[model samples]
Target: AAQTNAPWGLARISSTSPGTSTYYYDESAGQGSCVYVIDTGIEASHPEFEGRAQMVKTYYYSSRDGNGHGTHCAGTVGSRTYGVAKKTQLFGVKVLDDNGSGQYSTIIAGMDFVASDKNNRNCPKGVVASLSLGGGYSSSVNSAAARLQSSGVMVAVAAGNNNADARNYSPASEPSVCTVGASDRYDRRSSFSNYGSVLDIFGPGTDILSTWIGGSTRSISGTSMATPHVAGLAAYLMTLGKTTAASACRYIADTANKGDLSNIPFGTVNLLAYNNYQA
Candidate 1:
């Protein structure tokens, strides 16, 4: 049962015990699903993508990933080597800038694109939108995410790194999205991860290694790195017919590894995401 081919994050999900250092999953790992990386952008040319990644939408002048955040997140979502859904199609929806900062309007615009994209409409394997950015409460961004969810795009968002109540943030607090916090190799809540009742689940974020800009790979941490893991999981669930937002959300919650993480804040669900790879 050793999953020697997976990153620690991936390995952590497919089994309950820690220290597996490998990944296990169904062969149908998001074969036709689409996961949108709504962050800085994605380096479509990264060899780890194996031509499965593409920059489909950009609000600014260029679609290329300048900051490595978007590419890294994309890699976690669907890259051939470091991803949760190895066969899922990846689309870069550039909402943030090279500095990894963006306005509410721009971010909402990217959400709108995912909600309205023709390719996403009735896609055979379903669609998921992963957002790794958030700030203080913004009604505009929250509402946009809600609308996108209503249109059938499953959303998984970062709970932020403020180490405070996740309910105080925008997308993380949005009830429509599947908000994610961060956990480490030892199954402890990441020190910088936001928590509280708003968080839907935890994903590996510490020392996560993923694809970066210029076809390279890098290791980093944050709730930003955790969100895409859930996004990828949602895509994989969709392949099993949990195509609706509500159904996928419930399935993820029901299958998560309960009480497996430490230092979770009071009122927060002590759940870590799982891929349901029954051995």
Candidate 2:
């Protein structure tokens, strides 16, 4: 992967960069893990991501790339080396089509796909599912997320970007989901990130540089960006023996830096603490 002084790179180093080079290696390095990115369709041919990702499945519940939102979200999760979980396998579940929206039924169908695959012995083990889209919280969504969790699939979601209490969205607000909030370079909560006790963690989401369609790059910002950071980190944690979704989340929460809880709402989490625990 090409090295750049991008903000994501800085955040990656800040969280995992130990003084020793040997120790601060990529968390996903050498781990052959698979993660399902339940979002829009992926480019699949971007040079940075070419041959680096394996898409086990694709679902286009919507038509075309609606305003490019799904593509952007998909890139953040698993677009070649630009993503945090560079080596992880990605399954592109297109619950939202090009129009950038999907019905609740579509979302549940995607969850069902994950649940079914997880329960099948023929499928890969230790798959973490990443969901960057969200609507209001729903009992049905929570039930689906809980079912996936019960089947040993880690589910990560974006704590909505509307800057409200994160407890309002399904999946993200669901008690069983790993809700991700957003932070800036100073580790302060982003002005747009939702906050609440339901928020499980925070990650670099301000002006993030990630892959775009056709081997391009863009500066995107949102809680959506932070969701994948946690997803990637969770996959890495699982490799380190934090197998269950709750355990991986607790590991991050317990080890995250605790210096500035004032700026963050209740339950804000830092990843540097998790890196220390891994060390």
Candidate 3:
């Protein structure tokens, strides 16, 4: 069934014009793909997960989500209700803290887990890691993200919320990682979204509604919200045989709806993520 009252972001991606308010997607959007949410943590038991979301590893307290950022990002990545890739397996690799802050060492540790997990026979094929957190530029984190991508993980990262040049950030500045910016329902760059040539593309990030901690829902705005939508789309494309990181990245950029956004920062590409679903 099509989503008649779908979230504006979801609806916006499926069509060229705004205000359709409906989501059209394949039933098997992300069947058999795997997505790792690298953030604080996830509420694995959130009803929206339908039992597929889980905490595979954590560098913080536990697998429980103290802050809601990870849960919300995971929900957008694969939750049955608000996700882009509805059938992808969700993994939470906690690196940030309850207050949404963490050290680069901790984040690199999470990236290590994901890079090593690629060899496990039990791990799902077509792996994607969504990083919705970032800070000052760090050569360590940048190298870690590059290694993960070299290991065949399709990495999607946030362009930060600084409203400045994204090149000043860490993993987001790494050339190998797909750095994402935020756009709104009106096709304008989000006010707080960092932008630059480093940003690979934009996604509907303003006023995004998704699953929250404690089995609830909320609407928030940030480039953090935009990254998962691209991650989810990468998962969807992976199921169609774009399994390699380079291939997936190329296809995403090529298939994106180009020249459709406004207020994009100079030097930032004016491309919006598209799900390839047309009604």
Using all chains and alpha carbons, the TM-scores for the candidates as numbered come to: 0.96, 0.84, 0.96
Candidate 3 lDDT tens digits, 19-109: 7888888777788888999998999998899988888888765778899999999999998879888888898888988999899998998
Q: Give the higher-lDDT candidate: 2 or 3.
A: 3
Tens digits of lDDT, candidate 1, 1-279: 334758889998787888987788887889878888999999999999999888988887899999999999999999988998988988899999999999998898889888889354445778889999999998888999898888888899999999999888988999978999999999999999999888888999999999999889999999999999999999988986754555686688888999989998779999999987875
**Ordered list by lDDT, greatest first:** 1, 3, 2
TM-score of 1: 0.96
At residue 68, candidate 2 shows an lDDT of 51
Instruction: Write down the lDDT that model 1 would get.
Output: 0.88
CA displacement after TM-score superposition, residue 276 of candidate 3 (Å)? 1.4
Model 3 earns a TM-score of 0.96
Give the range of the ten consecutive residues with the poorest summed lDDT in model 2. 16-25
- Model 2 sits at a Cα RMSD from the real structure of 3.7
